[PDB]
Design a protein around this ligand. Structure first.
Ligand SMILES: Nc1ncnc2c1ncn2[C@@H]1O[C@H](COP(=O)(O)OP(=O)(O)O)[C@@H](O)[C@H]1O
Ligand SMILES: Nc1ncnc2c1ncn2[C@@H]1O[C@H](COP(=O)(O)OP(=O)(O)O)[C@@H](O)[C@H]1O
Ligand SMILES: Nc1ncnc2c1ncn2[C@@H]1O[C@H](COP(=O)(O)OP(=O)(O)O)[C@@H](O)[C@H]1O
Lengths: 267, 441, 449, 438
């Protein structure tokens, strides 16, 4: 006897079994019964303070002259204030650049995490290699102020012969695994699920904005991984090339039998 | 189904005349109160005018004298046109945000913008669908539909065939292809293809074919408040906030720009502003930090009319320590205009109990109604209005038809009125925990 | 199998004519409270209720919550009953009126039929089919599949969206894994390797299940018991579907949020749409607020508007206070801690103290409930302690007095065991007497005053 | 045109020599306060101000905020005016010495002139030239026109779904694009496509218009601190990732002053110093009159008009000192204090006439005396709130103008606070079942 939690949304019921015989196509028809009906003046034309259409004549000027001209993170407005007591004095010594800071001060928390996902750490390795009394604790001058990046006991701990400190830094995972909290059957589950509420606005621009925000294929690509065609064109080439999801940035689910769903199978 | 009989499910409007403003004594539920209902009629007729600011009318009066009744009458005598917003004054003290801003959102929720624009829709039973997916894809296809009058064939784009296999439109569905967007809301199933449906329940509703033409334009009228637009223009996809309360401190420049664009929409004739009603129930539960903002939110052009109800006499103001009439400061009592109510005469008590008896459909003998009026003279309306619901059930215990004196005298015997409860507390001091002592026999 | 404080209570013990017969189904005496509780129970089971106030007065140790468990065992299993306290609603994430409304909509139930549309198959050929992808930064994107499901009677070769492919992809479905695609959300739980690929020389510890018999496109109806607060939480924080809001919203930590008025009205209209289709059945319930005097005045203000709703469960308040001061404003005193304006809604049920024979009957019932048999002189001794000291003190002198009896090789409890357990284990009154007498001065052998 | 409590306030009503004249521009009397507020308006326009404080005395019922709205309509739409009450300074996300600086940075204005070159029209071709630059022909109903695009604005066109013949709206300067719809010449290509079929615009293709437009410095602070609006798509979660107000440090403001002075030295923008009107300043506690005494000494601070109606009251947050106006004498010496005296009985009738001809409610001279009687004997805010209900009692009973009888009915239908207090005390005598609960 299989089961699942209750579903609050509005799917599409199949008509009959004797019609769609072999070659059928599933459609993502999940919509919320809770709706929110907006006109095409507020949701599309000139009600949003971000959409730069006619009538909303401010949103182009305000976008340009607050994100690219009068901005204290554009590289021209950093290059004039980097020479002394001034405000971007410290930027030479943190392991960044002007383009690094300009990309870090405009993207999301998400896209900045994807940019962190393809940066090989090296200041932990300095403590492994450059570890002599004669070597006077060498740090690169363009990475000088990253002190806590440099002296880290974890980097030395991951190298030692006996793992007497690697059995202390992640003992939470060992205690969580040895209690059997991954093989234990999930006792509780939510009693109702629902898709997120969408706007019933009857323009094509609303459907374009919904399928570019609610789905937003850049985050889906950065979350699930690369296409196998991309893996073929990156692994049969003559030279090594990089990938924008360098690995599948989906986190490993901490429950082995039931991952990311609520569906229950009897046993 | 979600129309369970509450304590105000018998009020179907304010009940007054709309031609000479005379409070006729028994109509639409509100029975007995005359002067307060005429003043509420004057306030109601200056709400629908629109040519006045956000003013403040204070429904002051004793407990259980029909103040929430007058407010619910004004709520029912407007329909779903002018936005009425209830506000019990303890929804303001939140933790997701501050307190003055939680009050400002409740002011912005009651100023609607009403705009009317057209759509083009299609009714009709689908006769058949053919889709040329042959390895092929969603490229071309034919749709033959009909009403009772029309019948037509359409060819479909790729981003419509991808909407036809999305909703799985069968041969016999009653669909509504909104032409400007492309969504498909299946209104039901046609009866004439009842044989053609196998993967349905045994009990399944079936409609008829739509009557009239197949391609028509609707003049839908939407009305959304300024708080709606404020929460929409606050995040990336922020309207979910007004369904989950996760909105925070909204910056004031967004509210200023939306107050500018609503005026620019009004002057171009694209919009229309509807001032609503805000009912601050139990207004004495606000501290002076609230009144020092309501004193200035009732000044702008965009302010709804505030109706509010106070029970307390000379009482203390929260936040401070000094007493004042009605629990309100005097610099704020200069703003408000007060309607005083009165206690109820016994014949009005009898016919209010008669209306509350006819609402729940409980039969009463006149002797039991006389006894119930005699109880309501000494214990208030709420106790007798609960004795009705108790006495019907006690008559249903012993399989009777009409309630009588032998059941009202049991409901009065088991369930104490609060006067005898105060006497029970005063005569059972040593075991009930007053402040310090517990004595056990 | 653990005897709690309320185990002998099995109901009110009422006759056919609604008259309480004393010493029946757990209770002893207490006529005028149990008849009124029977009236409340039949008020619940008649559905003409949209918010009624029932107060249970009476001093501590007189059985206010024994009546509450009697009501909760008289209504049944399939009627919602939410017991809370007055200190439980003071939270740190939301305002306390949100916790009140969440309890009010925990106390309303709904019984809904659902038709799930499973695709229960064994994956035969899994091959992605990407689409055109010009220069836009993210690169290629898989847009179409050709997954072939193979049940026992008639296979099928179906085509998928990108989102249902991502639902597959976050489940790690290889070739051979049986699945059932749930075409309500889009979710698809892998069950295991099919038994046509079975091999005892294996290491992954997979669960081998046979091929699912029947048609690959099944359709099954179930019955579900969902409260309105479950629908509020479902539409508030979305955790269903295969988009990004409903996927990045189940990796974050869950927070209680403030479900506003508009969602609580729209879900009411959705439930009314369910009822008008002849599918769902509404079953209202009880909110039992024990210790209602701990609620401050900002909660009794909001209970007025919470009870003026056209759909609102019946409230049963318990308050063991006399003339006391309300927690919110410390300058108006009233009976029970209830404010004098909110008190008029309530149908106040009193509760009277006991008698020196009713204590004997309660001691006998409690002794034959826990499993401690004893003699009549010992019953008279425990009833003497019940008259002198307290009611729920003399019940607690039965659990050591069994054990000490098992110390002395006995089976039944005699006078000596209770005469020793009254000396080992003390009450509050004699402890306060020892406190006042011995604790004369603060110092080394004194008490911190 | 809907009536507020200050609809009839148009301006201060002064002479050319800065002397107030009675019954001018909506005011009645109140000479010295209007002369002092005229001097304040001239000080704001003179641009020799880096933090000045102006307090307005006088009890409730007198015209304190009418002077402030007179100043706000005397300056015009150009110079920014930020009215905030005291109670708005409290939040649950930031400290209350930061909402003051947010109001100071909302007060200062920065005016930029732009010449937006908009391009409405139907796409004729999408031709990639180099292998990069992609020409677009924008066909109007007056003629098509070639257009060479940057290789970064084309990646903003391409994110939008523009294929063959979609009408578009290209901003030339700011590079902002919107797809309006599919043109109606390509309407019936297929028969049930789903687009918004709009006609080709019957104007120019190249419309050149200029716009003067303001930016407050607080919007610069927020737009330079956190990413706002455009690419902030992770804010749809809501819990921790929403645009929560954050503690804008002094270093960020100290750099934004450098950047704005750079763009003022190029002659691009203009600077206009604004007005912060803090109303009911007793709600400001002593942990903010300490911070104002520092923050007004900046060389960038705007003028602050404080309003306070109290006498010798207790300063909030420190219960063991009394002071005039609820203002600490550490701070009260900074302020220029302007008195606001009460109203004579011959100066209430003119307020009744002006408030009556603002709402359109016309009435006889035998009723103006009765409204002035209620204005003298009770209050001024109450007598002005019987002109609007009595008109509702005028057109219902078959009349047009308001007589004595409608106001004699409205004084019984609409009781004030004083007679309600007398009914609350004397008539509501016993506290029982049918009594008030004190
Ligand atoms: N004029 C009236 N007509 C009918 N019922 C009334 C009237 N006035 C009061 N009631 C009833 O009396 C009860 C108390 O009214 P309510 O306004 O809730 O009291 P309070 O003003 O203390 O809130 C309500 O349940 C209402 O049904
Ligand atoms: N009528 C009764 N019959 C049997 N036991 C009772 C009765 N009334 C009270 N008790 C006992 O009193 C104890 C405490 O009662 P409780 O309801 O917790 O007191 P309070 O009313 O102070 O909450 C319970 O363990 C219960 O067994
Ligand atoms: N000189 C004046 N001319 C006309 N109306 C005035 C004048 N002064 C005050 N008022 C009236 O006073 C009311 C505003 O009082 P207000 O200044 O808000 O008092 P406070 O500042 O104490 O709150 C307005 O309704 C306005 O009509």
């Amino acid at each position: 006897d299989t089961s699942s939690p209750f579903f609050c949304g509005h799917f599409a019921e199949t008509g009959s079994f004797l019609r769609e015989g072999t070659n059928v196509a599933l459609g993502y028809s999940t919509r919320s019964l809770v709706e929110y009906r907006l006109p095409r003046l507020i949701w599309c034309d000139g009600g949003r303070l971000d959409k730069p259409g006619p009538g909303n004549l401010v949103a182009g000027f305000r976008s340009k002259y607050l994100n690219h001209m009068m901005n204290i993170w554009t590289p021209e407005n950093i290059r004039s204030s980097l020479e002394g007591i001034e405000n971007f004095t410290w930027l030479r010594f943190v392991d960044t650049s002007l383009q690094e800071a300009y990309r870090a001060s405009h993207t999301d928390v998400f896209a900045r995490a994807v940019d962190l996902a393809s940066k090989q750490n090296r200041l932990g390795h300095m403590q492994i290699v450059y570890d002599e009394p004669e070597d006077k604790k060498w740090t690169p001058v363009h990475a000088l102020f990253q002190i806590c990046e440099r002296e880290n006991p974890k980097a030395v701990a991951e190298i030692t012969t006996e793992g007497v400190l690697r059995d202390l830094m992640n003992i939470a995972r060992v205690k969580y695994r040895e209690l059997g909290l991954c093989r234990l059957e999930k006792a509780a589950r939510p009693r109702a699920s629902a898709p997120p509420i969408e706007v019933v606005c009857d323009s094509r621009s609303a459907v374009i904005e919904r399928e570019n925000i609610m789905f937003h294929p850049a985050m889906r690509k950065a979350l699930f991984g690369p296409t196998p065609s991309e893996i073929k064109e990156a692994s049969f080439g003559p030279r090594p090339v990089t990938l924008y999801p360098p690995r599948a940035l989906l986190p490993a689910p901490d429950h082995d039998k039931q991952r990311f769903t609520n569906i229950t199978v009897p046993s | 189904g979600l129309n369970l009989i509450a304590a105000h499910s018998h009020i179907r409007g304010l009940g007054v005349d709309a031609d000479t403003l005379e409070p006729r004594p028994s109509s639409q539920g509100l029975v007995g109160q005359e002067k307060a209902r005429k003043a509420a009629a004057v306030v109601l007729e200056m709400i629908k005018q629109g040519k006045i600011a956000g003013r403040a009318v204070l429904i002051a009066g004793p407990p259980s004298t029909g103040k929430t009744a007058i407010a619910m009458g004004m709520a029912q005598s407007l329909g779903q046109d002018v936005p009425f917003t209830t506000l019990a004054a303890s929804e303001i003290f939140s933790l997701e945000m501050s307190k003055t801003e939680a009050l400002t959102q409740a002011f912005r929720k009651s100023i609607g913008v009403r705009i009317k624009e057209e759509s083009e829709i299609m009714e009709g039973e689908v006769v058949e669908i053919q889709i040329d997916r042959s390895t092929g894809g969603a490229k071309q296809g034919k749709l033959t539909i009909k009403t009772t009058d029309m019948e037509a064939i359409y060819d479909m784009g790729s981003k419509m065939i991808d909407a036809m296999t999305k909703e799985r439109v069968m041969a016999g569905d009653i669909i509504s292809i909104d032409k400007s967007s492309g969504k498909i809301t299946k209104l039901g199933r046609s009866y004439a293809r009842s044989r053609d449906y196998d993967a349905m329940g045994v009990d399944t509703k079936f409609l008829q074919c739509p009557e009239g033409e197949l391609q028509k334009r609707k003049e839908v009228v939407h009305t959304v408040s300024l708080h709606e637009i404020d929460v929409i223009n606050s995040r990336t996809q922020g309207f979910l906030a007004l369904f989950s309360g996760d909105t925070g401190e909204i910056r004031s420049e967004i509210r200023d720009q939306i107050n500018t664009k609503v005026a620019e929409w009004k002057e171009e004739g694209k919009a229309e502003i509807v001032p609503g009603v805000l009912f601050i129930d139990e207004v004495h539960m606000l501290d002076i930090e609230c009144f020092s903002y309501i004193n200035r939110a009732l000044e702008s052009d965009l302010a709804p009319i505030v109706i509010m109800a106070s029970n307390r006499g000379v009482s203390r103001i929260r936040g401070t320590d000094y007493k004042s009439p009605h629990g309100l400061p005097l610099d704020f009592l200069d703003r408000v205009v007060i309607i005083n109510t009165h206690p109820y005469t016994p014949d009005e008590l009898r016919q209010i109990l008669s209306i509350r008896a006819q609402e729940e459909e409980v039969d009463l003998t006149p002797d039991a109604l006389a006894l119930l009026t005699k109880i309501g003279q000494e214990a208030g309306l709420r106790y007798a209005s609960n004795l009705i619901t108790t006495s019907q059930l006690i008559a249903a215990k012993r399989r009777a038809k009409q309630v009588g004196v032998e059941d009202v005298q049991r409901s009065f015997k088991l369930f104490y009125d609060p006067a005898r409860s105060v006497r029970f507390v005063q005569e059972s001091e040593k075991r009930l925990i007053g402040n310090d002592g517990v004595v056990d026999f | 199998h653990r005897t709690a404080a309320h185990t002998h209570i099995k109901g009110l013990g009422l006759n056919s004519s609604g008259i309480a017969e004393k010493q029946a189904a757990g209770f002893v005496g207490q006529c005028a409270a149990r008849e009124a509780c029977g009236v409340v129970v039949d008020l619940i089971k008649a559905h003409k209720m949209a918010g009624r106030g029932v107060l249970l007065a009476g001093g501590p140790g007189t059985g206010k919550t024994a009546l509450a468990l009697a009501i909760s065992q008289e209504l049944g299993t399939k009627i919602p009953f939410c017991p809370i306290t007055g200190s439980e609603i003071y939270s740190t994430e939301v305002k306390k009126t949100e916790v009140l409304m969440e309890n009010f909509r925990r106390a309303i139930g709904l019984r809904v039929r659902e038709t799930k549309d499973v695709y229960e198959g064994e994956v035969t050929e899994m091959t992605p089919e990407e689409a055109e992808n010009p220069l836009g930064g993210y690169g290629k994107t898989i847009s179409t599949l050709l997954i072939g499901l193979k049940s026992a009677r008639g296979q099928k070769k179906l085509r998928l969206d990108p989102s249902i492919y991502e639902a597959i992809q976050k489940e790690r479905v290889q070739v051979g894994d049986v699945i059932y695609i749930e075409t309500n959300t889009g979710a698809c739980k892998r069950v295991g390797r099919s038994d046509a690929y079975a091999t005892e020389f294996d290491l992954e510890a997979e669960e081998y299940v046979p091929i699912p018999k029947g048609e690959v496109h099944k359709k099954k109806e179930i019955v579900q018991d969902v409260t309105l607060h479950d629908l509020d939480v479902a539409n508030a924080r979305p955790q269903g579907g295969q988009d990004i809001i409903s996927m990045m919203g189940q990796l974050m930590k869950p927070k209680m949020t403030e479900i506003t008025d508009k969602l609580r009205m729209e879900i009411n209209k959705v439930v009314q749409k369910y009822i008008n289709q002849g599918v769902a059945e509404l079953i209202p319930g009880v909110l039992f607020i024990d210790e209602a005097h701990m609620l401050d005045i900002e909660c009794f203000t909001y209970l007025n508007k919470a009870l003026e709703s056209p759909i609102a469960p019946i409230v049963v308040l318990a308050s063991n206070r006399g003339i006391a001061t309300i927690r919110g404003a410390d300058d108006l005193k009233a009976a029970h801690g209830i404010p004098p304006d909110f008190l008029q809604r309530l149908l106040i049920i009193p509760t009277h103290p006991y008698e020196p024979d009713e204590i004997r009957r309660i001691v006998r019932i409690r002794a034959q409930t826990e499993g401690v048999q004893l003699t009549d002189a010992a019953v008279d001794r425990v009833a003497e302690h019940g008259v002198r000291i307290s009611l729920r003190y003399c019940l607690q002198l039965l659990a050591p007095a069994s054990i000490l009896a098992r110390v002395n090789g006995r089976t039944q409890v005699d006078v000596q065991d209770i005469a020793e357990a009254e000396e080992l284990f003390l009450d509050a009154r004699r402890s306060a007497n020892i406190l006042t007498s011995t604790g004369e001065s603060g110092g080394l052998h004194g008490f911190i005053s």
